[PDB]
Amino acid sequence: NTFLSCSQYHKMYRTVKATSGRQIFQPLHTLRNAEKELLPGFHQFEWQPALKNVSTSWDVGIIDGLSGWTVSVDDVP
Amino acid sequence: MSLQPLTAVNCGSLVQPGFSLLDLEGDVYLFGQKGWPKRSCPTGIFGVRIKKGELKLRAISFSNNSSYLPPLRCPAIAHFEAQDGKPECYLIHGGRTPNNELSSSLYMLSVDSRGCNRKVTLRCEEKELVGDVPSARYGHTLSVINSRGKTACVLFGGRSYMPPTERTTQNWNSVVDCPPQVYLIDLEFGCCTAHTLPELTDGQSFHVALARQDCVYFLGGHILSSDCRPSRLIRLHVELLLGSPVLTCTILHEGLTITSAIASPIGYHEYIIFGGYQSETQKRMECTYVGLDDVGVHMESREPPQWTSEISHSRTWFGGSLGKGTALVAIPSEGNPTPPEAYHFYQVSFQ
Amino acid sequence: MSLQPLTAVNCGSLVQPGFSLLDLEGDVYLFGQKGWPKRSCPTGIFGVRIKKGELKLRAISFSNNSSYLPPLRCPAIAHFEAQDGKPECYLIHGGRTPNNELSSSLYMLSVDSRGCNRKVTLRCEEKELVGDVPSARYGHTLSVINSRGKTACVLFGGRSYMPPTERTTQNWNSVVDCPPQVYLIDLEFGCCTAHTLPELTDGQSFHVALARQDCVYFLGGHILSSDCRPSRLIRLHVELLLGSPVLTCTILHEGLTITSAIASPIGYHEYIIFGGYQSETQKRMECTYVGLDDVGVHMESREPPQWTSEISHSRTWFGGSLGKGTALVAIPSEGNPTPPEAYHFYQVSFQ
Amino acid sequence: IMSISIRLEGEDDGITIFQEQKPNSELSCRPLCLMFVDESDHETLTAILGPVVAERKAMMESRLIISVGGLLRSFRFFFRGTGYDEKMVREMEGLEASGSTYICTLCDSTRAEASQNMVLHSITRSHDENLERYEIWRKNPFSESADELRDRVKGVSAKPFMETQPTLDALHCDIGNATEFYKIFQDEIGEVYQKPNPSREERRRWRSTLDKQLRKKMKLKPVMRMNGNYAR
DNA sequence: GATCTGGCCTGTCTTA
DNA sequence: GATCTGGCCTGTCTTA
Ligand SMILES: [Zn+2]
Numbered sequence A: 001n002t003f004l005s006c007s008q009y010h011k012m013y014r015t016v017k018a019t020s021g022r023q024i025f026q027p028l029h030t031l032r033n034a035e036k037e038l039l040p041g042f043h044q045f046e047w048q049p050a051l052k053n054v055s056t057s058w059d060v061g062i063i064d065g066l067s068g069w070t071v072s073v074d075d076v077p
Numbered sequence B, C: 001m002s003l004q005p006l007t008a009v010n011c012g013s014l015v016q017p018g019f020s021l022l023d024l025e026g027d028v029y030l031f032g033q034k035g036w037p038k039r040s041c042p043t044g045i046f047g048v049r050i051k052k053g054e055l056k057l058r059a060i061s062f063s064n065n066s067s068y069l070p071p072l073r074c075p076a077i078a079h080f081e082a083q084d085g086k087p088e089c090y091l092i093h094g095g096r097t098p099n100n101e102l103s104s105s106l107y108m109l110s111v112d113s114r115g116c117n118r119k120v121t122l123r124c125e126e127k128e129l130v131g132d133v134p135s136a137r138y139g140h141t142l143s144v145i146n147s148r149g150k151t152a153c154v155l156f157g158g159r160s161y162m163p164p165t166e167r168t169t170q171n172w173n174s175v176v177d178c179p180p181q182v183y184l185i186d187l188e189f190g191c192c193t194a195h196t197l198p199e200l201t202d203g204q205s206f207h208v209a210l211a212r213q214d215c216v217y218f219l220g221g222h223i224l225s226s227d228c229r230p231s232r233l234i235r236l237h238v239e240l241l242l243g244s245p246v247l248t249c250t251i252l253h254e255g256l257t258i259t260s261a262i263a264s265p266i267g268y269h270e271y272i273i274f275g276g277y278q279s280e281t282q283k284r285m286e287c288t289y290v291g292l293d294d295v296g297v298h299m300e301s302r303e304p305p306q307w308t309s310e311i312s313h314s315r316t317w318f319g320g321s322l323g324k325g326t327a328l329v330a331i332p333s334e335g336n337p338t339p340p341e342a343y344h345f346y347q348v349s350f351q
Numbered sequence D: 001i002m003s004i005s006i007r008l009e010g011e012d013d014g015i016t017i018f019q020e021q022k023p024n025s026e027l028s029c030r031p032l033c034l035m036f037v038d039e040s041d042h043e044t045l046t047a048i049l050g051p052v053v054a055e056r057k058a059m060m061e062s063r064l065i066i067s068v069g070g071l072l073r074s075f076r077f078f079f080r081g082t083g084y085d086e087k088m089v090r091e092m093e094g095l096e097a098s099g100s101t102y103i104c105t106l107c108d109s110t111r112a113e114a115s116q117n118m119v120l121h122s123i124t125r126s127h128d129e130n131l132e133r134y135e136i137w138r139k140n141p142f143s144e145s146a147d148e149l150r151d152r153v154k155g156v157s158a159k160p161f162m163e164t165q166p167t168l169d170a171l172h173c174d175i176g177n178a179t180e181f182y183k184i185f186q187d188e189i190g191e192v193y194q195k196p197n198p199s200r201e202e203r204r205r206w207r208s209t210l211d212k213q214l215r216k217k218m219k220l221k222p223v224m225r226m227n228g229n230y231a232r
Numbered sequence E, F: 001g002a003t004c005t006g007g008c009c010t011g012t013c014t015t016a
Helices: A006-018 A028-032 D043-059 D086-091 D127-139 D146-152 D171-189 D200-216
Strands: A045-048 B002-006 B020-023 B028-031 B045-051 B054-059 B076-080 B089-093 B106-114 B120-127 B141-147 B150-156 B159-161 B175-177 B181-185 B192-196 B209-212 B215-218 B233-239 B246-252 B263-265 B270-273 B287-292 B297-302 B318-323 B326-332 B343-349 C002-006 C020-023 C028-031 C046-051 C054-059 C076-080 C089-093 C106-114 C120-127 C141-147 C150-156 C159-161 C175-177 C182-186 C192-195 C209-212 C215-218 C233-241 C244-252 C263-265 C271-273 C288-292 C297-301 C318-323 C326-332 C343-349 D003-006 D015-019 D063-068 D071-075
Touching (some): B020 B076, B020 B318, B089 B141, B141 B215, B141 B233, B263 B318, C020 C318, C076 C150, C141 C215, C182 C244, C192 C244, C263 C318
Parallel strands (some): B076 B141
Antiparallel strands (some): B020 B028, B089 B106, B106 B120, B150 B181, B181 B192, B215 B233, B263 B270, B270 B287, B287 B297, B318 B326, C020 C028, C028 C046, C046 C054, C076 C089, C089 C106, C141 C150, C150 C182, C182 C192, C263 C271, C326 C343
């Protein structure tokens, strides 16, 4: 919410810990596992009746939108 | 065998990677365009004239009693030649709607009247198919056969989307080869029969098919199961008798390993295979000649016209046949800002 | 009285808010180009022609003996009329170069030869002033008098940069009115005398000065000390009698409250005054007529032409006198994208 | 997510629970798909967005089950497509963009017809009716010429693929109306009802003096394309 | 050579 | 009416 870049935040963390720390802020690698709940593909859910033409796997994260294009040359690329 | 660089002065955004060139009654008609029809041309079909290097596209208008067509991207064109009763017919089936779908309907295109002043009116009719209809597909091939003495059509090959039950919103734009059965279609009525091929255990696509005197010869076509481009040639023989359309088949040992070739007619039955893709990276540069007689295919490589560095180093290329030993090819272009003409055009001529 | 808009045909980017129109021998010459002289016209001076609304600028060329001029922005122009020796002269002094410094050098401009094919050659001679030179200033006025029978010049008014004691790099760009002493300059030689008079309390700037028959009439200037635009009319009477150019002065009742006016001669000694500004905020809209004779100045309000809403709602406006009852006015123009032509132009004509 | 309400056990059309107090805010707008695709071309846009519209059209039917607040609860979904401007609504419903004869996306009135008659019109257009009308235009059962057939389907020449609720965008409506009034003022600076054929230079001079005035007062500087702040 | 009409071209209008 | 010359016009090159 303060639009701080990851590398700028790590800079802030190192500077606030090296001087008088007594470290307050958490390191990056504990943030990277902290949001695994906020992103999609974490909670269990289920429809009824089962959806049409949609798979039932409930853990699909970021999927590439091309959706299985047969990149082979001769078709529309 | 010389190539002339053309300028697509105006209307160079209507051509797209896959499209068709119908050669009927002299002048050629471009068919297929980017997006749906715009009000400049409410039909979708342009007339092409090449003069002094200029490529000029003119708007064509349909007749009063004809239905209209979506701009099918990669359809299967079959040239039904002049005879009783309505020359000159083109059978189109079935292609890809620009709203990305597969159309399973067959269209029949013909010429109606003229001029008054250098104007041609066309007419399109949907042809209802009572079947046993072949599943909607693109890239397949249709060919007309005349046998003792009646007329039929042979439909073979092509790809299609995943079966309707197994298509998942992640495998949506996935595409697999349709099963390998040959469909015999009567022009009228819509009785279409399906027959199995004991020798062909797999289908293909993008294979140039040449039909002469109730014999059909299928050149190589790209297979997506094994990712192989077979050099073998396929011959099939349709013997139309009352009332079972028996079909037989055989393999020829050697043919050109080619996919998406521009098959331009020159002589009576002599064609030139103008080139395409032999591997996923390298494109065919050599021009080949294919004469067709009842003995078999006679194949000789001919001196390919000297290609400028641009068309020799291009990633991909496509085109179509303007007829009379003349063909059109296109190369996508780069630059900044937009050219905006995304395609440079070349006209290759034989003899 | 009439006005016509003029189209600012190409090369209209050389007109800046302060500039001069030197009217000599038919066509008039724009002077005071924006920026330094670009090698499109290495002189700096232009001939102007107005034909069917088109304002076309041609590049004049100096002669071999001439020293070259920097494009001063707002100098003091004095028209020395046609007589012995070399008619007719324009005295330019002194203005400020495109680098913000003040010239303090008197230049004399004359014509040399023509044509052949619609070509006119000029010549600029810098003339030395020995003295007791006048301090570098801009906006002042110089006027030409003929007194029994010697020709002299009276130099008065004008702002200047602060003296080089209180000059401070925080008060660098500030200007203050030069001390009010009249300088009498001989055309030849450069012997310049300086006289002071009690009735002239402070100097002025941008005050139109008129000169006839060894008498000079100063209209209302703009005094920067009390911020007043005095409506007093000033008169001074000089005579060059060996060996002093003895000078006296008088105040008059009514003088117009305009600064930076466009004084166009129309009659023998009758002028039409267009005016720049009545007050700091509100510009002058009325046009006035000022005749002058041995008795005194005679004022008459003449009907001003109907102004377009644009030139009536303009904040600032400038121009000069093309002569012969014709004058040229300019309006800065606001628009996005940049027009780029900044100044829209009008031609006003009397009778 | 605009609002979430409860109905059970019944007797109430709804009993609202959560209503987004700031719908237009940038803090409440959840991205779903990002693409590097042009808007003009149709084939790439539809090939990528096929699946999204497909599972959206398949989701309206069934009911979701989530473990929330400790218990298993059931949800229904209503989708309202309203955030598209007119260009995209026209091109994704089969109409002709954008200066056609058939002006209204909600009605069938033509450009000249809604000039005489202005204030009386009734909303007709909908998704299914446009699908059926594309079917009429392609099958062409009565065999009319191009213009008559275009008149029968009131200008549906392409198959619609996305469904769009018949509403009006607010922001671009304000921008369009402010550009209309800016042309009216640009006309009224000069006299256009006295001199009906003004020259191009006169147009430029009128726009220049109007922008000069609108700079002296209201503290505005002109813009090439007119954003919404200039309209307000 | 006189006639004509299809289509080419150009300017304004509309939402972006 | 022929001739001549200045200035107008356009394309390319240079840093931005
Ligand atoms: Zn409406």
